[PDB]
Symmetry: D2
Subunit: 491 residues, 4 copies
């Protein structure tokens, strides 16, 4: 949801500088400050070596509590910070990789040196930035708001927009470090007081051997893992928004959601009379949901793009373009729901990006690459939805489901001139969606404004990176983006 940052030996001035542009509150730590935006969540608890802070939220508390409850009865009533603290002290830092959520866990030790654990999927990207002072934050613009326009040093666009695939620790900010998701990090200072980050991954590469898991056990597993995220949200939400494209992924989420929540709000978007309203409407009627559409203009499409960049700090062309559809939905649902579920990521797990009937030497490898890519882009950041009063959730993106699909036999993902076979089989087994739907132009508009080809994501990344820098340096306002300013960034 809302962002946060920590500044080593920060001053009240640093905090007041941030609050002039970002609403929130500061809290003193042993040797510095902690700032959390107005809609941010966090919990704390005293530990043996210091105070533990858990910023953000947890998505699988039921699973986490079930785990700690194995040895500690107090897990059932522990706050987010206490819960992870139990896992930490009993099973070590590696156990926190088991938690899902847009969270960041850190222990504030007396010596000012803190130990931090970053969530392992990219729901909460964390950076360590070296400015006048050392900062740790999941929002680079907070550092600019505190230290000024020149705080972040950006790399040459030619060196940045030259590659589409990057390590999960990649950042275009020269004076910054992107903390690897799913790792423990200790923020030390040497004899002269210079910042030195000691990092260690909490996970190891999983086996790539084909997983020949029988059909029945597989379907039972998909069902349990897709519903778990919903069973966790149901208890605290009566209404839920869902972006309905009419496609299998979003339709499946709606079908499952109609069994956990009482009120369902579905939203559909199109462009240039090029849409899927036909199918989308059929799903809404089939399940009796509060449906409503909206045909986006070329202007609204670009707006969704720049908004995803501002809020989720996305500098990647492809990712910003895909996020456009979600941001236009947030705007339509704003004030109508507080929780949203999407079918996002399903194509990366079950083979939706594969070409039907085509042959692949290693389809799982091709997919795994895309699952990893999402770790650094910012597509999974929750800031955008938070600023719309929405708790965004992606049911498909759970550790258990992701791991299941990682090496799942391909014939389940691409077979007999079809894709996502096993998902479709699971879909109609619910007896909720019509065979028609189960089956068993943003990229263009974006290219249009830039004056390039639809497939040229290098020119699209050069533009997105442009607005990225302008937004993070504070020279562009998310509230005031004139068409002239946009055109300047284009050419």
């Amino acid at each position: 949801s809302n962002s946060f940052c920590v500044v080593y030996k920060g001053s009240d001035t640093d905090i007041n500088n941030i609050q002039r542009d970002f609403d929130g509150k500061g809290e003193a730590l042993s040797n510095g400050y902690l700032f959390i935006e107005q809609n941010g969540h966090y919990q704390k608890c005293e530990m043996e070596r210091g105070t533990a802070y858990l910023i953000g939220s947890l998505y699988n508390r039921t699973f986490l509590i079930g785990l700690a409850g194995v040895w500690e009865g107090e897990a059932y009533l522990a706050n987010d910070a206490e819960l992870l603290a139990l896992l930490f002290t009993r099973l070590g830092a590696n156990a926190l990789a088991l938690a899902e959520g847009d969270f960041c866990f850190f222990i504030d030790e007396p010596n000012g040196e803190l130990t931090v654990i970053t969530e392992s999927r990219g729901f909460s990207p964390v950076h360590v930035v070296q400015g006048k002072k050392a900062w740790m934050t999941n929002s680079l613009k907070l550092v600019t708001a505190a230290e000024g326009e020149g705080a972040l040093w950006f790399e040459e666009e030619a060196l940045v927009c030259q590659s589409l695939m990057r390590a999960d620790t990649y950042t275009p900010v020269k004076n910054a470090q992107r903390l690897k998701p799913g790792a423990v990090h200790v923020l030390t200072h040497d004899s002269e007081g210079y910042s030195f980050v000691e990092s260690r991954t909490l996970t190891t590469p999983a086996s790539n051997q084909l997983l020949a898991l029988p059909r029945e056990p597989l379907l039972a597993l998909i069902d349990r893992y897709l519903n778990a995220p919903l069973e966790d949200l149901a208890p605290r939400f009566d209404t839920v928004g869902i972006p309905l494209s009419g496609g299998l992924d979003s339709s499946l989420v709606t079908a499952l959601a109609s069994r956990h929540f009482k009120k369902l709000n579905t939203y559909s978007i199109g462009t240039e009379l090029s849409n899927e309203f036909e199918f989308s409407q059929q799903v809404a009627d089939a399940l009796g949901t509060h449906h409503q559409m909206k045909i986006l203009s070329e202007t609204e499409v670009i707006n969704g793009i720049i908004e995803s960049i501002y809020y989720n700090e996305i500098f990647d062309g492809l990712s910003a373009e895909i996020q456009s559809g979600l941001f236009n939905v947030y705007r339509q649902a704003q004030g109508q729901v507080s929780c949203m579920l999407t079918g996002y990521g399903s194509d990366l797990l079950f083979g939706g990006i594969l070409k039907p009937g085509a042959q692949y030497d290693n389809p799982n490898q091709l997919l795994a690459e895309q699952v990893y890519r999402t770790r650094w882009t910012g597509e999974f950041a929750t800031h955008g939805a938070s600023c719309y009063g929405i708790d965004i959730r992606h049911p498909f993106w759970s550790h258990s489901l992701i791991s299941l699909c990682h090496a799942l036999h391909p014939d389940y993902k691409i077979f007999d001139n079809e894709v996502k076979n096993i998902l479709r089989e699971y879909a109609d087994s619910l007896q909720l969606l019509p065979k028609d739907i189960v089956w068993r132009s943003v990229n263009q508009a974006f290219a249009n404004v830039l004056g390039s080809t639809v497939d040229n994501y290098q020119t699209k990344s050069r533009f997105t990176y442009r607005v990225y820098q302008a937004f993070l340096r504070g020279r562009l306002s998310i509230t005031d983006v004139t068409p002239s300013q946009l055109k300047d960034l284009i050419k």
Copy 2:
């Protein structure tokens, strides 16, 4: 007949003497030899630092798989050894304490030494005995059969039968040490080849603060943890036997079982007095279980006692006394069932051993003491039931249910002249059992005597004579 033992720096010859008294197969290890009884189960897998071995079985595979599945899809198709290995390498040794079962895990490192993890509840007690050679086993008699009648050195009964409470590492065998349950051990050797055990607990004491958990959530948890053990056994068993005492404990298990298994075989034993065949038959009639009762003779009561001492190597009088009924049920159930569920343990978790209306300064402390006590008695060993072709299981004795009750608020256990209140409430809410059922030092000297007699090979389980027992003072 599901025991095992390992001899450090031993050969297959050192196992020969064992195979003359116990049937089973031997397997070579990097440095030493392993022996497994005829009906013993075991799996293996190749790790980076050696070969991993898992002896015995796992009760919460579904839970362990769900845990390793978070990061590894290979968990779904892994044997017990590969499954614990995944947990070991990714979450460390401490993770193996989350597994439930009468198992022992160890890694045969090519560096000579082996790393051992013992199960955390006492389902499979492991000793390291120092005789002519060093042995690690879950059955002390195996060492005797290997090295002779005098292999094991016993303590003076005067010092053994004195106290009623002991640490979970206590053993009456002077030349042996009992490996702490729920611990990782490294059996190394110094510059002169002398054995040295480096142990470390995999757990720490839990909070003793009163757990003021609301009623609804609490009941939801009870229902979950009590049923989980059955959901795991249901898939691989058509029929299941249950020792029906007619009480709330055994009755509840039968009620739940009837919702997971197709065929239910209930057994009720007892003597002319203190028996409860009426109540049992009532429950049996309500659940429509295949019900059978039998009155035991004084010889049978005693036989049940000595058999528990032999099979589960129990030297404690109280524990061997309680096991009598169970072991008599095994005999009556032999050949009819392969899986049995009991209500064992319930009384220690929900306050069943407490007196209604009585006032206690700290009831949970008394209960926790008894929970801990079961770790060394051997009452939870599975050897006895196994030799009868039965997989013994105690639904109540799960990590989660035990931990939950550890500091659960006393009012749930003993309130207004009542005990097991919360349990009774969960029971009748099922609408399955009749409301009337739900309610809504001289012995230790003898036990220890037969214990030594059996472990040293003097007395034999199939040769036990009434006069031989009497001769024991």
Copy 3:
């Protein structure tokens, strides 16, 4: 004397019964209570994670300071405890195995847990006794004074006197455990308060490949390692006592001592069966020391044996027999000196136990076994000397010398019809001792009183273990050992 004990989770009242038979001071701990005998030494210092204690003394502070000094200047003026804490926090527990001395290091952790490191040679044998409460002491008899005559349970003599070679963790006390020397130990308690010792060794077995080290380098190493111990004692002692037998070992030590101390007192013993006063006098004359010879009677031999058993808690027959000479020397030197140097162990390193003309398949392995044997006997305990007001020191028994000789080429230990060849060359190079000495019957007296052969050490150990038991149970007095008691012990 200079012993100590700690009562895990105990109170100050638990010590009172001990102070009734042994004079000493108490010390309240966070997780129990400490007791140190009157002539005992101990230092302390606050660590970032508990209070550290060092009971006993260190023999190689110069080497330890030289090491710590590499990264910390405060090492030059740190007390023993602070000095080990520096090594502990920087190089881990394994570094404390580098320290020599009859010490024991432990951390009083606030979380109710003790972290202890035991010295690696056996100079200070530590045991954990389980009575009504858990005890950690370097003197079993202290537990008896605390809980009473039935505090310690002993094993059947037949099961104790049957073997000659044992593990360094062996103890005849059934309800006790002997902490392995040179290991780190954590004393904790489980959910029911029962104590549990978690141990880890600080060293791994060394190489057994022959060490083909050249002449000059070897001699330089021997010279360095044999002199360091004396250099450590020189600054604090003007006079030093030395058990002079007239043999190479004691003669070498005497020769080296004359170059470090201005006043040397030599002591020679013997029996009515034999003696080497001729050679002993020769050395004293060559070095001009204050010499004196004492001829022992059977009674004095036995007294020396029983005293080595009481003070050092030796239960082995052979070990006690050897110690008899030293204990009688202590009685003779008492009040005359406050420090003493011996050639003890020299034979286990350079091959003194080996005979010229004899054939050995693996001489180093025979020696190494004896080196290891001294770890559990008690021969190296310092209590006995302490009670006589003497700081006993064994120059030859240093980590570096023992390691050096461990696999030193046999040709240096036995060659050309002679043993201790290299040792003889080093002594000869000093130009202090007469060539006559450089190159060339307590056992009988002991056997005579027992009424057996001098080779039967099984019958002798049965006597020693018998007195060992009687002393530790408080059924016997070291002040008065009537003949009627001595007879029953024998048979």
Copy 4:
């Protein structure tokens, strides 16, 4: 020279491209290549888990062997690699920080994962650079030689020349990471094969509390540490070169050296603006050493600066300016000596850079800042001297001396209108140098060639960073570089 690099999954092409500009040889590792220049040194040995490699050399083997000799006899004949392996396995990685030398230790694991330990002083700066492939090297120019002129991405000079104090992990190369000196680093690869360095410091900040060590012991320690380094080189060198400036520092080193080596070659240099030939000649005469003078020209002066830049990869103006004198000396001594000693560093430990009679709130902190600064500049690199056939050594720069002086009471470094007080006292006590030397304009020439003021070091840094880049990009060659090409950089 003596540089080296390691390329993960490198190819014969990479190695051959390198040898096109640098002579040496490649060696295949488990999953990559090792490249070591012609005159580079290295040793290896098999470890329980992987092959251990030691590149470069050790300066304090006597001390390291003395430490490992405590538990292992094979320490005495172990090669440099086997020696650190002994410490590593027994005392952990932290123990390799005790070693001194221009070395890099790394363990090649079967899975391709490299465990590296970098020396703790900066004698062998190691970088990890991300080009087409990932490289670990102590010479950035080797990567350019392998992948071409564009392999290294350089930061804007304005950003690099804006400060003279940096973290010891600072590098002006954007696509590179400077490995912290005195740390362990695991070079892993995540699920998608992306490089991820896990680093941990081996040291912790020493105490800053004033060290009021008594004078007598102080002098004894200084003596021991300044001579130890000489005792290590003496056994393998008959002749040694010394850059004599007539100053107390170089003069003292010459005085001590004259008592360790047979022949001493003293070299002195001076500019046309001024010199120190007067005082230097006095020491040569006093100690009777083979002295030599040489007046440097504006050209030779600058040539010394750019050579320090090329060979030692220095980008810092100040540091490059200081090395000028040393490099001119290597040239004059080439072929005349194989080992050289300097008084380099003395001023930073004993207060030589402070102003006599001036007041300082915290003199030790100022000194400590400078001591740390040398870690990243490249002043301690040995490549320069190596290419001149010289094994350069700086006696003052030992861990023990550095640590001793770290917090040493200021009155020892600056008192009553004097500086380096305690050093002068120690020097005078030797009775080897004249009173006018013990006491009981290259910087200008550089400022003239550029055309700026001696005060303005940003213009000097500009030039140095410019030459740095040109040399590392392969544009300029140290073989045929001329002043004409350097003038083009000035403007």
